[PDB]
Design a binder for these strands. Structure first.
Ligand code: K
Ligand code: MG
Ligand code: MG
Ligand code: MG
Ligand code: MG
Ligand code: MG
Ligand code: MG
Ligand code: MG
Ligand code: MG
Ligand code: MG
Ligand code: MG
Ligand code: MG
Ligand code: MG
Ligand code: MG
Ligand code: MG
Ligand code: MG
Ligand code: MG
Ligand code: MG
Ligand code: MG
Ligand code: MG
Ligand code: MG
Ligand code: MG
Ligand code: MG
Ligand code: MG
Ligand code: MG
Ligand code: MG
Ligand code: MG
Ligand code: MG
Ligand code: MG
Ligand code: MG
Ligand code: MG
Ligand code: MG
Ligand code: MG
Ligand code: MG
Ligand code: MG
Ligand code: MG
Ligand code: MG
Ligand code: MG
Ligand code: MG
Ligand code: MG
Ligand code: MG
Ligand code: MG
Ligand code: MG
Ligand code: MG
Ligand code: MG
Ligand code: MG
Ligand code: MG
Ligand code: MG
Ligand code: MG
Ligand code: MG
Ligand code: MG
Ligand code: MG
Ligand code: MG
Ligand code: MG
Ligand code: MG
Ligand code: MG
Ligand code: MG
Ligand code: MG
Ligand code: MG
Ligand code: MG
Ligand code: MG
Ligand code: MG
Ligand code: MG
Ligand code: MG
Ligand code: MG
Ligand code: MG
Ligand code: MG
Ligand code: MG
Ligand code: MG
Ligand code: MG
Ligand code: MG
Ligand code: MG
Ligand code: MG
Ligand code: MG
Ligand code: MG
Ligand code: MG
Ligand code: MG
Ligand code: MG
Ligand code: MG
Ligand code: MG
Ligand code: MG
Ligand code: MG
Ligand code: MG
Ligand code: MG
Ligand code: MG
Ligand code: MG
Ligand code: MG
Ligand code: MG
Ligand code: MG
Ligand code: MG
Ligand code: MG
Ligand code: MG
Ligand code: MG
Ligand code: MG
Ligand code: MG
Ligand code: MG
Ligand code: MG
Ligand code: MG
Ligand code: MG
Ligand code: MG
Ligand code: MG
Ligand code: MG
Ligand code: MG
Ligand code: MG
Ligand code: MG
Ligand code: MG
Ligand code: MG
Ligand code: MG
Ligand code: MG
Ligand code: MG
Ligand code: MG
Ligand code: MG
Ligand code: MG
Ligand code: MG
Ligand code: MG
Ligand code: MG
Ligand code: MG
Ligand code: MG
Ligand code: MG
Ligand code: MG
Ligand code: MG
Ligand code: MG
Ligand code: MG
Ligand code: MG
Ligand code: MG
Ligand code: MG
Ligand code: MG
Ligand code: MG
Ligand code: MG
Ligand code: MG
Ligand code: MG
Ligand code: MG
Ligand code: MG
Ligand code: MG
Ligand code: MG
Ligand code: MG
Ligand code: MG
Ligand code: MG
Ligand code: MG
Ligand code: MG
Ligand code: MG
Ligand code: MG
Ligand code: MG
Ligand code: MG
Ligand code: MG
Ligand code: MG
Ligand code: MG
Ligand code: MG
Ligand code: MG
Ligand code: MG
Ligand code: MG
Ligand code: MG
Ligand code: MG
Ligand code: MG
Ligand code: MG
Ligand code: MG
Ligand code: MG
Ligand code: MG
Ligand code: MG
Ligand code: MG
Ligand code: MG
Ligand code: MG
Ligand code: MG
Ligand code: MG
Ligand code: MG
Ligand code: MG
Ligand code: MG
Ligand code: MG
Ligand code: MG
Ligand code: MG
Ligand code: MG
Ligand code: MG
Ligand code: MG
Ligand code: MG
Ligand code: MG
Ligand code: MG
Ligand code: MG
Ligand code: MG
Ligand code: MG
Ligand code: MG
Ligand code: MG
Ligand code: MG
Ligand code: MG
Ligand code: MG
Ligand code: MG
Ligand code: MG
Ligand code: MG
Ligand code: MG
Ligand code: MG
Ligand code: MG
Ligand code: MG
Ligand code: MG
Ligand code: MG
Ligand code: MG
Ligand code: MG
Ligand code: MG
Ligand code: MG
Ligand code: MG
Ligand code: MG
Ligand code: MG
Ligand code: MG
Ligand code: MG
Ligand code: MG
Ligand code: MG
Ligand code: MG
Ligand code: MG
Ligand code: MG
Ligand code: MG
Ligand code: MG
Ligand code: MG
Ligand code: MG
Ligand code: MG
Ligand code: MG
Ligand code: MG
Ligand code: MG
Ligand code: MG
Ligand code: MG
Ligand code: MG
Ligand code: MG
Ligand code: MG
Ligand code: MG
Ligand code: MG
Ligand code: MG
Ligand code: MG
Ligand code: MG
Ligand code: MG
Ligand code: MG
Ligand code: MG
Ligand code: MG
Ligand code: MG
Ligand code: MG
Ligand code: MG
Ligand code: MG
Ligand code: MG
Ligand code: MG
Ligand code: MG
Ligand code: MG
Ligand code: MG
Ligand code: MG
Ligand code: MG
Ligand code: MG
Ligand code: MG
Ligand code: MG
Ligand code: MG
Ligand code: MG
Ligand code: MG
Ligand code: MG
Ligand code: MG
Ligand code: MG
Ligand code: MG
Ligand code: MG
Ligand code: MG
Ligand code: MG
Ligand code: MG
Ligand code: MG
Ligand code: MG
Ligand code: MG
Ligand code: MG
Ligand code: MG
Ligand code: MG
Ligand code: MG
Ligand code: MG
Ligand code: MG
Ligand code: MG
Ligand code: MG
Ligand code: MG
Ligand code: MG
Ligand code: MG
Ligand code: MG
Ligand code: MG
Ligand code: MG
Ligand code: MG
Ligand code: MG
Ligand code: MG
Ligand code: MG
Ligand code: MG
Ligand code: MG
Ligand code: MG
Ligand code: MG
Ligand code: MG
Ligand code: MG
Ligand code: MG
Ligand code: MG
Ligand code: MG
Ligand code: MG
Ligand code: MG
Ligand code: MG
Ligand code: MG
Lengths: 121, 129
RNA sequence: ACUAUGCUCACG
RNA sequence: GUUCCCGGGCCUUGUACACACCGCCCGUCACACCAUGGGAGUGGGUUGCAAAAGAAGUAGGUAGCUUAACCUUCGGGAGGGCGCUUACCACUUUGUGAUUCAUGACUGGGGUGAAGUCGUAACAAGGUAACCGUAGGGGAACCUGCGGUUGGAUCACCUCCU
RNA sequence: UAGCUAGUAGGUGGGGUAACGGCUCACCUAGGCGACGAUCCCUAGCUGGUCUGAGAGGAUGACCAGCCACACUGGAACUGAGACACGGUCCAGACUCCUACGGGAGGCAGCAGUGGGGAAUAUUGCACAAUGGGCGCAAGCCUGAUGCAGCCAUGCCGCGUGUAUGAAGAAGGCCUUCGGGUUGUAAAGUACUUUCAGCGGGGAGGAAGGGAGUAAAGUUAAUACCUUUGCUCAUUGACGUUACCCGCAGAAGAAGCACCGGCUAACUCCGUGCCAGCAGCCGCGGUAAUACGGAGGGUGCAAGCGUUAAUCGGAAUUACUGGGCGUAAAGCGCACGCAGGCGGUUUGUUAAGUCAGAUGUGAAAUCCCCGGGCUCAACCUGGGAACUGCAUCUGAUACUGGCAAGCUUGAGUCUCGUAGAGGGGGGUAGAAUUCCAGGUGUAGCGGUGAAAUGCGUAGAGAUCUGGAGGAAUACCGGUGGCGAAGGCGGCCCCCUGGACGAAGACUGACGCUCAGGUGCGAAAGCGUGGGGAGCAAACAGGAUUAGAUACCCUGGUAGUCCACGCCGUAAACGAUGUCGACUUGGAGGUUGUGCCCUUGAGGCGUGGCUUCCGGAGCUAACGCGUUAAGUCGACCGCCUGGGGAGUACGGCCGCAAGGUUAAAACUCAAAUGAAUUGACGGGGGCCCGCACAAGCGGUGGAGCAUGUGGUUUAAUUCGAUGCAACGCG
RNA sequence: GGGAGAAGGCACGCUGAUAUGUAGGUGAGGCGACUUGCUCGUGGAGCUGAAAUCAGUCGAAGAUACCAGCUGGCUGCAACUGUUUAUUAAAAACACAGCACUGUGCAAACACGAAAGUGGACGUAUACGGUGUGACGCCUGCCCGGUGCCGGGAGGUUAAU
């Protein structure tokens, strides 16, 4: 406030940080993968959630969630990554794209198959 | 310390109306009389004088129609911290043209309605709804 | 006088 | 007989409580993960200053060699061209800083994790009112001093007065 | 990032340049720049525009157009009108090349293409036919500039996938109120058309010309050559089996994929059981899931649909339009004050601002209206406004500024007083505490919830006598006063700051705020030197307790005191920045000064400062309320979710303790304020009941009966489990 | 204050010219004047004389000989200059300023001396002696059973007499 104060020091716009540092406004990004493993979520849930550490191509080391029943990821195996927090596993803030590269589709899905990467029956 | 005298005038009016008060004394001036005349001429204030020689005290006499006051609202636009000069076509119209904007133009102080037809703009002193 | 604690989640 | 004990009722107040004191809840310690500071250092990136360096070119200076047109008296003059040299200056070399990005044994705290250990610091007068500054102390919340705040509670307890 | 700069800044002598000039010399002067952010650091082509937005704005600079820059990296100049030259020369470099090893090459950020990078962007295509440009008298070369098409759901837009009738309301699925409904006019069908690709015949329109030999009219000595307008000719199409117009056949070749708990258009059955999985936000699953997986059923879009990333929007969540700061985040602890912002009142004059007209110009494109050509649209295009622009002369002078000379109401001076723990320096008083020696005197004192440590028969405690020393000032003393805030209490002098009142006189706007700057700033700390009764961190011992590094008790050092320097913080608080104006009241406190009879502790005003309650108004509410949190103005400070964190890093400051400035990653969907109803309290008040007291007899000990637990067993069926299960069903 | 001569650089010879040797330095005769001179100003005759700059110029090399720092980085100990085992130890040992404890009221404590007497000191507690520690900065925690020391004086024990 005070018009003179604003002339002297203008309104600094709140530079809101991005949720997903995959950099350069990239839709997806490849990842070599290390350590596929099971983790427990926060309080009201209780489960064994499937997750893997992603060694990205640009240099970053993140965790991506393995959405769907069962997976073909192990030790290495190159996978594709998209943006999206799970909102349960604290730390995990990316999603593996099922279908693309070594990450196969979920076995025997019918409803919603672009999600989870399955072809027609 | 008493930097803007014109804003102080318009508060004595606005606060005087709020108290249901008949008259409103204040220190006079050239510009005070100009504004107070434009308010009188359209019909917010019902008569005024400028009684005094050395130390002139301009007193207004506020109008009341019902129990409600006549001046619904009144506010300083071109305060001294931020002067506001508007062009002919860019002159405002308060309350969609049924309240007035007092505007100091080069041919004396006048209403925004008079300033349009006269064909000139100026410093918009106050809105009077 | 002083005198501790209550394992998790659950009322569209 | 109503002081205390157990329960209940009504009014009133405080409340960080609301499966509603069998309430909530603090910090250390243990374990897991993540980001993060310090760290003997190590390794790149950019860059300042102080120098050396001098390729080509251009400009100046010309003992040396050399020559179409001008002037020639057919001796040679002028003028050029090589070559040489001086200045500017590129690559490159040296020293020393600056900054920035990686990385480092170990280490300091921080965050996060359904059901670990130790206590109970706060919320009620939370059982020593709490908190703020500061100093010392202490496994841990914290405790104690000095000063400050009310964002403290009760005032039919006395026994006698407003 | 607060200082930077020596050809640096000027001037001249010379010198160069197309030309002005430190562009370059020689001297001469020693400046120039910078808080209106220099310098340094990071990032970046710029604009017309694009995108979003109601608009202001925010974002942005692909595609078309203008300008700049660069050409393997780093230099350099030459040649010309024009370059320090994109396929020029020249060096030096790195990295590929060819070498007969002496020496030679080479430069796709022109078009295709490769590897590589990547989440990801295209064919070693086709033609100069048009449209430019280069060349030339032109006949035409060359033109991967233009034109096209390969590829690509990557867009904006169009048409497709059939169209009538169809009851047995088929079956099969699917729910079943096993009666039936439902998918469902859906299908199968029963009639008709054939768009669209797929075959085939016709076949526009991109094309103006160019060229020949010609007539005339120009040209001229000339009916020659040349030129122009009539004028006769033949032809030119990459795209191209064009666009398009007719015929072939027969529904034929042509539909997904999201979603379905709320937000948000749309329901059930199974399978699973806090597992498997969904998740944009809230949140779904613990054996009857509308949220998970499946199925049907629906809904929403459909040649695309979802997800993803990215910008604006909603977000008035950086608020200029358009927010706030008593308690939610947020008033610096309080002053002084330069630069800066703002400034009472009255005439005169300039016109800087402002306003009015003036001409220029805002390249064309898009964007916007009236039109037009694509069969329609998309696209294309003609004109119009628009282009909210920025400059330029002329006036208007109200307002603001500049410059006048005032005026006196703000502000200040003097004059006489009033009150006050305002300050600083020096004295001195009385009570008491501790202690010191002395008299008396006989067992305890002290302390606590209760005890003990402690102190005492060496004679304490108690009592009195005389000292010594230190610190603090009972009562007065108050919702009293003073101070900017911090803060300041015995009495007396010394020096000293302000406040207020009374009526004048004087000055004549001298004012208000204040980033940096600077001062003062409780307590605790810190340094050097004094002092040291009481008190008392630390510390010790005795208790308490499960433990008690606490609370309680007995001891007790730094410190609290002083002088001088530092520190620079507090819930430094009315959690409320300073100054000024304005708008109903009541009761008081406190200090003035008037009018009246002091006629008797009064009668009646009117200034300061102050406490309490309340009106309008405001506020989320609580509350504030003429001492505003009301209504307005001036300026400053500050705020932008909670944690991380007032922390780290650097800077400054400090002897240190540390202060001050002040982030980011990461993480959470809350954190927060006020108030409401309960419940609770080792909160308060009032009551009650074999609740307790006052009794009386019991259980708990024994044996036995019964009933549970457990254990045993082939089975010891099952249920009931604090009170309110256990001689219970 | 330092570190710091940190490190690391570059320039130097000779000869001309600026200036037929200059900024300066010392300044004679001369000109006036004051008082009375071993005068003042005043002017500069010689004489002396760097250091620069610009140009030349020789050598492999110009501070050309003699002369005359090696430098930097991490670290233990001692703050420092100093002192020490004459003659195998120069150090981290001693001292040191500063720090604390402690004694000492002056005929001081203490010291040398059968003593007289000196020193301490012709000083007087901001002084003196002893002891430890060792600039400076941040600090210096707990124990008084043992041994010493200080104070206390009842009781017990206790010599000479
Ligand atoms: K203080
Ligand atoms: Mg579903
Ligand atoms: Mg206009
Ligand atoms: Mg426990
Ligand atoms: Mg609990
Ligand atoms: Mg619980
Ligand atoms: Mg009760
Ligand atoms: Mg009742
Ligand atoms: Mg209460
Ligand atoms: Mg409270
Ligand atoms: Mg309260
Ligand atoms: Mg409350
Ligand atoms: Mg619960
Ligand atoms: Mg509890
Ligand atoms: Mg905790
Ligand atoms: Mg914590
Ligand atoms: Mg050189
Ligand atoms: Mg050369
Ligand atoms: Mg030349
Ligand atoms: Mg040459
Ligand atoms: Mg010759
Ligand atoms: Mg010849
Ligand atoms: Mg001859
Ligand atoms: Mg000659
Ligand atoms: Mg010649
Ligand atoms: Mg170089
Ligand atoms: Mg280099
Ligand atoms: Mg860094
Ligand atoms: Mg590292
Ligand atoms: Mg590191
Ligand atoms: Mg390791
Ligand atoms: Mg655990
Ligand atoms: Mg835990
Ligand atoms: Mg407490
Ligand atoms: Mg507690
Ligand atoms: Mg307690
Ligand atoms: Mg307490
Ligand atoms: Mg407490
Ligand atoms: Mg409390
Ligand atoms: Mg502290
Ligand atoms: Mg201390
Ligand atoms: Mg400790
Ligand atoms: Mg322990
Ligand atoms: Mg303690
Ligand atoms: Mg305490
Ligand atoms: Mg204690
Ligand atoms: Mg209170
Ligand atoms: Mg009672
Ligand atoms: Mg000078
Ligand atoms: Mg819009
Ligand atoms: Mg908007
Ligand atoms: Mg728009
Ligand atoms: Mg481009
Ligand atoms: Mg342009
Ligand atoms: Mg290129
Ligand atoms: Mg090139
Ligand atoms: Mg080049
Ligand atoms: Mg160029
Ligand atoms: Mg070229
Ligand atoms: Mg080139
Ligand atoms: Mg070559
Ligand atoms: Mg080459
Ligand atoms: Mg090329
Ligand atoms: Mg290319
Ligand atoms: Mg290239
Ligand atoms: Mg390729
Ligand atoms: Mg192709
Ligand atoms: Mg071709
Ligand atoms: Mg061809
Ligand atoms: Mg061809
Ligand atoms: Mg061609
Ligand atoms: Mg052709
Ligand atoms: Mg052409
Ligand atoms: Mg052409
Ligand atoms: Mg021509
Ligand atoms: Mg021809
Ligand atoms: Mg051709
Ligand atoms: Mg060619
Ligand atoms: Mg071609
Ligand atoms: Mg085609
Ligand atoms: Mg498009
Ligand atoms: Mg697109
Ligand atoms: Mg049909
Ligand atoms: Mg269906
Ligand atoms: Mg049909
Ligand atoms: Mg059919
Ligand atoms: Mg049909
Ligand atoms: Mg067709
Ligand atoms: Mg035809
Ligand atoms: Mg044609
Ligand atoms: Mg043509
Ligand atoms: Mg023709
Ligand atoms: Mg053809
Ligand atoms: Mg052809
Ligand atoms: Mg085609
Ligand atoms: Mg065809
Ligand atoms: Mg075709
Ligand atoms: Mg036919
Ligand atoms: Mg037919
Ligand atoms: Mg839903
Ligand atoms: Mg609803
Ligand atoms: Mg719905
Ligand atoms: Mg059923
Ligand atoms: Mg879903
Ligand atoms: Mg059912
Ligand atoms: Mg189910
Ligand atoms: Mg469906
Ligand atoms: Mg869509
Ligand atoms: Mg998004
Ligand atoms: Mg927004
Ligand atoms: Mg906004
Ligand atoms: Mg605003
Ligand atoms: Mg806000
Ligand atoms: Mg708060
Ligand atoms: Mg607050
Ligand atoms: Mg304040
Ligand atoms: Mg204050
Ligand atoms: Mg000012
Ligand atoms: Mg004015
Ligand atoms: Mg005037
Ligand atoms: Mg005049
Ligand atoms: Mg005029
Ligand atoms: Mg015009
Ligand atoms: Mg025109
Ligand atoms: Mg125009
Ligand atoms: Mg557009
Ligand atoms: Mg267009
Ligand atoms: Mg149209
Ligand atoms: Mg068509
Ligand atoms: Mg047009
Ligand atoms: Mg147009
Ligand atoms: Mg036009
Ligand atoms: Mg028109
Ligand atoms: Mg027109
Ligand atoms: Mg335009
Ligand atoms: Mg004029
Ligand atoms: Mg006039
Ligand atoms: Mg001004
Ligand atoms: Mg002025
Ligand atoms: Mg006057
Ligand atoms: Mg005053
Ligand atoms: Mg008096
Ligand atoms: Mg006083
Ligand atoms: Mg006084
Ligand atoms: Mg006083
Ligand atoms: Mg005083
Ligand atoms: Mg004093
Ligand atoms: Mg006394
Ligand atoms: Mg006494
Ligand atoms: Mg005695
Ligand atoms: Mg005695
Ligand atoms: Mg005892
Ligand atoms: Mg005892
Ligand atoms: Mg005794
Ligand atoms: Mg004794
Ligand atoms: Mg005795
Ligand atoms: Mg006694
Ligand atoms: Mg006594
Ligand atoms: Mg006494
Ligand atoms: Mg005394
Ligand atoms: Mg006061
Ligand atoms: Mg005040
Ligand atoms: Mg005095
Ligand atoms: Mg004052
Ligand atoms: Mg005064
Ligand atoms: Mg007065
Ligand atoms: Mg005046
Ligand atoms: Mg006057
Ligand atoms: Mg200030
Ligand atoms: Mg300040
Ligand atoms: Mg101070
Ligand atoms: Mg003070
Ligand atoms: Mg001070
Ligand atoms: Mg103090
Ligand atoms: Mg002290
Ligand atoms: Mg000290
Ligand atoms: Mg001392
Ligand atoms: Mg003491
Ligand atoms: Mg005590
Ligand atoms: Mg105590
Ligand atoms: Mg303690
Ligand atoms: Mg003891
Ligand atoms: Mg204790
Ligand atoms: Mg104990
Ligand atoms: Mg005591
Ligand atoms: Mg005192
Ligand atoms: Mg004193
Ligand atoms: Mg003093
Ligand atoms: Mg200070
Ligand atoms: Mg301060
Ligand atoms: Mg503060
Ligand atoms: Mg205070
Ligand atoms: Mg207070
Ligand atoms: Mg108050
Ligand atoms: Mg505050
Ligand atoms: Mg002030
Ligand atoms: Mg006054
Ligand atoms: Mg009210
Ligand atoms: Mg308001
Ligand atoms: Mg209210
Ligand atoms: Mg208030
Ligand atoms: Mg008032
Ligand atoms: Mg008033
Ligand atoms: Mg007042
Ligand atoms: Mg006020
Ligand atoms: Mg206010
Ligand atoms: Mg408020
Ligand atoms: Mg913020
Ligand atoms: Mg935040
Ligand atoms: Mg945050
Ligand atoms: Mg800090
Ligand atoms: Mg500093
Ligand atoms: Mg310091
Ligand atoms: Mg300290
Ligand atoms: Mg701050
Ligand atoms: Mg959490
Ligand atoms: Mg809060
Ligand atoms: Mg509350
Ligand atoms: Mg209770
Ligand atoms: Mg109660
Ligand atoms: Mg009964
Ligand atoms: Mg009883
Ligand atoms: Mg009995
Ligand atoms: Mg009995
Ligand atoms: Mg029993
Ligand atoms: Mg029995
Ligand atoms: Mg028994
Ligand atoms: Mg029997
Ligand atoms: Mg049994
Ligand atoms: Mg058995
Ligand atoms: Mg049973
Ligand atoms: Mg049972
Ligand atoms: Mg059971
Ligand atoms: Mg029951
Ligand atoms: Mg050296
Ligand atoms: Mg030096
Ligand atoms: Mg040399
Ligand atoms: Mg020489
Ligand atoms: Mg001479
Ligand atoms: Mg000469
Ligand atoms: Mg000579
Ligand atoms: Mg000479
Ligand atoms: Mg010479
Ligand atoms: Mg001479
Ligand atoms: Mg001379
Ligand atoms: Mg001379
Ligand atoms: Mg001379
Ligand atoms: Mg002399
Ligand atoms: Mg003489
Ligand atoms: Mg001479
Ligand atoms: Mg020399
Ligand atoms: Mg030279
Ligand atoms: Mg030479
Ligand atoms: Mg040489
Ligand atoms: Mg030498
Ligand atoms: Mg040496
Ligand atoms: Mg060193
Ligand atoms: Mg060692
Ligand atoms: Mg030494
Ligand atoms: Mg040492
Ligand atoms: Mg010696
Ligand atoms: Mg010696
Ligand atoms: Mg010796
Ligand atoms: Mg020796
Ligand atoms: Mg010796
Ligand atoms: Mg010997
Ligand atoms: Mg030796
Ligand atoms: Mg030796
Ligand atoms: Mg030595
Ligand atoms: Mg040593
Ligand atoms: Mg020593
Ligand atoms: Mg000391
Ligand atoms: Mg001492
Ligand atoms: Mg002796
Ligand atoms: Mg003697
Ligand atoms: Mg003596
Ligand atoms: Mg020693
Ligand atoms: Mg320290
Ligand atoms: Mg010790
Ligand atoms: Mg002892
Ligand atoms: Mg003891
Ligand atoms: Mg002993
Ligand atoms: Mg003794
Ligand atoms: Mg003794
Ligand atoms: Mg004795
Ligand atoms: Mg005795
Ligand atoms: Mg005896
Ligand atoms: Mg005997």
């Amino acid at each position: 406030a005070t018009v003179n104060q604003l002339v002297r020091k203008p309104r600094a716009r709140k530079v809101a940080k991005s949720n997903v540092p995959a950099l350069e406004a990239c839709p997806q990004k490849r990842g070599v993968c290390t350590r596929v493993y099971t983790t427990t979520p926060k309080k009201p849930n209780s489960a064994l959630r499937k997750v893997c550490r992603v060694r990205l191509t640009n240099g970053f080391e993140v965790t991506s969630y393995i959405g769907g029943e069962g997976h073909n990821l192990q030790e290495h195996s190159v996978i594709l990554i998209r943006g999206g927090r799970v909102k349960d596993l604290p730390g995990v803030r990316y999603h593996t794209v099922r279908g693309a590269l070594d990450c196969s589709g979920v076995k025997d899905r019918k409803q919603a198959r672009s999600k989870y990467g399955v072809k027609r029956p | 310390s008493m930097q803007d005298p014109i804003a102080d005038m318009l508060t004595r009016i606005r606060n005087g109306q709020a108290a249901n008060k008949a008259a409103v004394t204040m220190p006079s001036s050239k510009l005070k009389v100009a504004i107070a005349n434009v308010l009188k001429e359209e019909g917010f204030i019902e008569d005024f004088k400028v009684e005094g020689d050395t130390k002139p005290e301009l007193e207004l006499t506020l109008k009341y129609f019902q129990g409600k006051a006549v001046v619904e609202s009144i506010q300083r636009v071109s305060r001294p911290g931020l002067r506001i000069y508007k062009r002919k076509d860019e002159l405002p119209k308060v309350m969609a043209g049924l309240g007035i904007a007092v505007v100091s133009t080069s041919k004396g102080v006048m209403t925004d309605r008079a300033a349009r037809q006269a064909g000139l703009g100026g410093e918009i002193i106050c809105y009077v709804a």
